């Protein structure tokens, strides 16, 4: 009786939200950006190849100086690379080799990683002893760690396969806030540039926008047909793009609270692993299971170019803060740095 | 053209590269085994004989190091992390023979043996384990022998025309699991009957792993 009545009210509320989004869907982003000229063909060459990982690379993250990056592989090794020289700055042996994510702190003093061990480990890069040591192991998730991102030297947000995201106080080792509401494994998260909000994509084919300080879900974004594997905020923080197993990328708007554009091709039938934007946001770069990275025109939904330099899955990618280059990590155990030439 | 500190930084990278190769060579001598199975299927008893997330067991038998991984605690979606175990030497699957007549507690109407068959079929025919051999352990053979006298195999298999002897009943179950394999050419299934008092289970794994490694070596050297 009471349960049946309540679940009927949820359906009425869902229709109310759907009608509200349809009311403000006066135009389409495709119609708005029809007049602007296309970006042309985007040609990028492999400037660097980072060798030394002996297994599938699962994650990479640029440092904020646009020169150092950290990559994670399931050979149990965290490696910090000097991308300008291809020098290895550090090699961190992992206690658990089943790593799925890695993060570089914006200060550059810490890196984080974690996987099937359900632990987010914090590593101190600046010690008087001259070696990288574990500073904290964040326990509390009951599923695998899928993504992690530093807010500062003391706070980090983690997404897990136990359907929840958590905000952690690194000094005390406790999760101050728990973000619940996903009905599937949360596979990725992206921080807003001001670090007041973050979006997460789960296996329920939905993306939720969370308030870091308040700790509740502000908005829910649906439209994908399969698990979301990747998510990335637009550079101004007013939009984000997702990548799913349905071979599509979608651009959702925070303020319009709905999808704006879909990035798919008939030839593309493989899942998407990673998504990122260029510095101006005009380009959307996506990594695919078909060993390639497709560069999309964000405004016009045109495939601007292809980065074909890997013999296995493109598992991760990232664009530097200055926008100079893009790195692609792959299951073939190599990292490549790309940019164009005049 | 490099500076004094640049040459030292390059030399540091060479030291790191040297240590990464040594770790890779050391990790290349380890046999990675993925341990799977349902609950109350002798999965924990096997680990005892072999001596919050993934549980790893290390043991050495005849100058061979084994890394066995248990992923029973992972209640998340299997397909999101099952590719992380692509490239293991073999998969060890544990099935309780005594659970042929028992009913799964959660469903209350599904036979335990059929539950193991569905789990075995999905893992064996998974796209990430096309070339991965499976070591099949049929535990609780002593308890299965006792239950055969009381309860025949007809409960588990309505279309079973065999006798009620222990040898015929056990052999029929072994063939049913091996018939679930669709990649007969690319992979091989090793089946063993284990008990609580058995001590040859580690020997069976060592023999099964050595056969798999040799076949992989022949494939790598061009003979296979």
């Amino acid at each position, epitope marked *: 009786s009471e349960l049946d009545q309540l679940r009927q009210e949820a359906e009425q509320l869902k229709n109310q939200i759907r009608d509200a989004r349809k009311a403000c869907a006066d135009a389409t982003l495709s119609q708005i950006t029809n007049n602007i000229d296309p970006v042309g063909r985007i040609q990028m060459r492999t400037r660097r190849t980072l060798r030394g990982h002996l297994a599938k690379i699962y994650a990479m993250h640029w440092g904020t100086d646009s*020169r*150092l990056l950290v990559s994670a592989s399931q050979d149990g090794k965290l490696i910090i690379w*000097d991308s300008y*020289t291809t*020098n290895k*700055v*550090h090699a961190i042996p992992l206690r658990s080799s089943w790593v799925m994510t890695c993060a570089y702190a914006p200060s*550059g003093n810490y890196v984080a990683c974690g996987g099937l061990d359900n632990i987010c480990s914090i590593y101190n890069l*600046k010690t*008087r*002893e*001259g*070696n990288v040591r574990v500073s904290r192991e964040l326990a509390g998730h009951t599923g695998y760690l899928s993504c992690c991102r530093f807010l500062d030297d003391n706070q980090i947000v983690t997404s897990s396969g136990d359907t929840t995201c958590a905000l952690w106080d690194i000094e005390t080792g406790q999760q101050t806030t728990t973000f619940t509401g996903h009905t599937g494994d949360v596979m990725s998260l992206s921080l807003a540039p001001d670090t007041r909000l973050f979006v997460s994509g789960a296996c329920d084919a939905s993306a939720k926008l969370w308030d870091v300080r308040e700790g509740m879900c502000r908005q829910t974004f649906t439209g994908h047909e399969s698990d979301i594997n990747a998510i990335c905020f637009f550079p101004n923080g007013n939009a984000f793009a997702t990548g799913s197993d349905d071979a599509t990328c979608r651009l959702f708007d925070l303020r319009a609270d709905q999808e704006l554009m879909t990035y798919s091709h008939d030839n593309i039938i493989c899942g998407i692993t990673s998504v990122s934007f260029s510095k101006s946001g005009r380009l959307l770069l996506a990594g695919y299971d078909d060993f390639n990275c497709n560069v999309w025109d964000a405004l016009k939904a045109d495939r601007a170019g292809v980065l074909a330099g890997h013999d296995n899955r493109v598992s991760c990618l990232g664009v530097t803060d200055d926008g100079m280059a893009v790195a692609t990590g792959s299951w073939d155990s190599f990292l490549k740095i790309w940019n164009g030439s005049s | *053209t490099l*500076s*004094a*500190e*640049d*040459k*030292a*930084a390059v*030399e*540091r990278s060479k*030291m790191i590269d040297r240590n990464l190769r040594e770790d890779g060579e050391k990790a290349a001598r380890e046999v990675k085994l993925l341990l799977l199975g349902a609950g109350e299927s002798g999965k924990n008893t096997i680990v005892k004989q072999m001596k919050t997330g993934i549980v790893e067991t290390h043991f050495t038998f005849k100058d061979l190091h084994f890394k066995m991984f248990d992923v029973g605690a992972q209640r998340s979606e299997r397909k999101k992390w099952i590719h992380c175990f692509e490239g293991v030497t073999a998969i060890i699957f544990c099935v309780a023979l005594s659970d042929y007549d028992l009913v799964l507690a959660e469903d209350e109407e599904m036979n335990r043996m059929h539950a193991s068959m569905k789990l075995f079929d999905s893992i064996c025919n998974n796209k990430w384990f096309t070339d991965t051999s499976i070591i099949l352990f049929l535990n609780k053979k002593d308890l299965f022998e006792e239950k055969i006298k009381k309860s025949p195999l007809t409960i588990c298999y309505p279309e079973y025309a065999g006798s009620n002897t222990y040898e015929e009943a056990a052999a029929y179950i072994q063939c049913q699991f091996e018939d679930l394999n669709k990649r007969k050419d690319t992979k091989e299934i090793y089946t063993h009957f284990t008990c609580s008092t058995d001590t040859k289970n580690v020997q069976f794994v060592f023999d099964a792993v050595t056969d798999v490694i040799i076949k992989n070596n022949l494939k790598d050297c061009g003979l296979f």
Partner: single-chain antibody
Amino acid sequence: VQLVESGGGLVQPGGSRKLSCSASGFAFSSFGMHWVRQAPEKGLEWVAYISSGSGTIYYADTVKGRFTISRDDPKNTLFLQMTSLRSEDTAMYYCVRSIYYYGSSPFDFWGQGTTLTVSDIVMTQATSSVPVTPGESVSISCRSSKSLLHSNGNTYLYWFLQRPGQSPQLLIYRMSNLASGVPDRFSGSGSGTAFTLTISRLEAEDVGVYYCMQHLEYPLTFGAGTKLEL
């Protein structure tokens, strides 16, 4: 982090002596090691360098062929085998650790030193002494015969402070970066061949001798040193 030197003492001319540097509290095998000596009432002089992994070894010309530098990584000991010792070798010998990667701070920790008594880019610090008063800003100038700015954008100039009775401590590395544990009042500014170390709001602890060192190429050379006195 500790670096204790031993083996120094009065030796006869033409003799041999073995200096040891025991390291504790840090990953010794990860750091390159230098020997730096200081003649009594004189400035710093670099002696030798051995890299991490013992693959690269450098010597100063005044000691090459007579001194041998070696390390024992399992024992965390740095060695300096000296032969044919001359009266020119009478100095306090310091054990200095230095690690080299992008963003590292070489020459960050020095040992207390051991005293031995026996019976090229030019770095110039023309101002030998500077009278100072507490709370007032002081600037120290250094010059080099060659440009210390490399084509990679780094300017390999270092600043050290040796308080009376203490081992030198790193203040500024690569001409602008502030060493860990150093107050922000110290600031390093330079261009090309001319460099300035500015000390805002001078305090009693800042009193000492200041050395500018170049790390552009070997042999590493020090300036004469500028002394601050009250």
